[PDB]
Design a protein around this ligand. Structure first.
Ligand SMILES: [Zn+2]
Ligand SMILES: [Zn+2]
Lengths: 51, 142, 116, 56
């Protein structure tokens, strides 16, 4: 389900930021950052296959 | 700060020699020395404003130079109330002694490089432009 | 509250407000597994709780010797033998009412005549 | 007061402006609001007072 990294996690779970948003990685997936391996391979596959 | 920046750009920088001012420059404020004044419009027929503007160029640096003549032009719109207002305005200056020489022809209109509103459609576009002119916790929820 | 879990990754869902229909939609935070909610309750918190006064009762409750026996009336099988114990909760302002468990049919009943 | 069910109900007022993220995290702040009525609201009496009894 497109798990994230740790460098953002330590900053989020410190008390530097406010309340953690409930749908942060849904917004990240809508942006398209740190997706699954399947979608990451599919993007390159559809980029090569269109050429 | 923008006003001061424009003022020193007028006073020291040579590629800016023309500064446009509103009624702020009419009053007693600090302005750089200048030799040429162009009066486009004015607050009706006020005799005080003419001498207030003319005193800005009376303290010119080139007064010691021989043959130096300061320039004071009053642009008026013919056959309109600019003529009436400017004739009322120049009364104090001609009582002081200054002579307002009329200029109805300028040599350079025929061969001017930049023509402003030369095309009739641009004049019309300007015309309709003028016509169209006239609880510490709930605080995070809002 | 009866939390519901996702059928894909086994994560408990969260309610989300939508303006399309204005209905309670419980969705998974991981894979967006959206489902309807069968109850409008999403959060519940009790100050005084009666849940846990009958906790720990299993099918072999009567085989333990230190639980005391009585001769009360079991209103499911009319038995003369049963075990009894007070409320296992350790609240400072709890009542001293007993709970009786029959051995023949494993029926539990209280001795609260204020409640009855 | 004479009702058999002792129910008091509360709602929070939505603003006229749009909320792109407040409605998603509304449940947590409503939990915080319930928490701040739980102990920070005094119906009657003064502070630093636990319990009063009477004697003759
Ligand atoms: Zn899921
Ligand atoms: Zn029984």
């Amino acid at each position: 389900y497109a798990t994230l990294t740790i460098d953002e996690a330590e900053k989020r779970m410190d008390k530097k930021s406010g309340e953690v948003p409930r749908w942060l990685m849904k917004h990240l997936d809508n942006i398209g950052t740190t997706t699954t391996r399947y979608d990451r391979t599919r993007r390159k596959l559809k980029a090569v296959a269109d050429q | 700060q923008e006003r001061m920046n424009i003022l020193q750009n007028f006073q020291y920088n040579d590629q800016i020699n023309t500064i446009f001012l509103s009624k702020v420059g009419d009053t007693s404020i600090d302005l750089p020395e200048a030799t040429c004044l162009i009066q486009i419009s004015s607050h009706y027929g006020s005799r005080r404003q003419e001498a207030q503007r003319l005193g800005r160029i009376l303290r010119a640096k080139r007064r010691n130079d021989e043959g130096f003549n300061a320039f004071f032009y009053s642009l008026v719109s013919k056959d309109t109330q600019e003529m009436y207002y400017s004739t009322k305005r120049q009364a104090f200056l001609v009582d002081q002694g200054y002579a307002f020489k009329v200029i109805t022809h300028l040599h350079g209109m025929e061969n001017i490089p930049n023509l402003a509103y030369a095309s009739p459609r641009e004049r019309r576009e300007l015309l309709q432009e003028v016509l169209l002119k006239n609880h510490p916790l709930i605080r995070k929820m809002y | 509250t009866t939390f519901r879990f996702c059928r894909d990754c086994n994560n408990m869902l969260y309610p989300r407000e939508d303006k399309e229909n204005n209905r309670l939609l419980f969705e998974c935070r991981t894979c967006s597994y959206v489902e309807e909610a069968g109850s409008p309750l999403v959060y519940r918190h009790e100050l005084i709780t009666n849940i846990g006064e009958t906790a720990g009762v299993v099918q072999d409750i009567g085989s333990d010797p230190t639980l005391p026996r009585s001769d009360r009336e079991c209103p499911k099988c009319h038995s003369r033998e049963n075990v009894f114990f007070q409320s296992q909760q350790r609240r400072k302002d709890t009542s001293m009412v007993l709970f009786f468990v029959c051995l023949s049919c494993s029926h539990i009943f209280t001795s609260d005549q204020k409640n009855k | 007061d004479n009702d058999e069910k002792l129910i008091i109900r509360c709602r929070v007022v939505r603003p006229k402006s749009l909320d792109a993220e407040t409605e998603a995290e509304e449940d947590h702040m409503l939990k915080k609001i319930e928490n701040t009525m739980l102990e920070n609201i005094t119906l009657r009496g003064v502070e630093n007072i636990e319990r009063v009894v009477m004697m003759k």
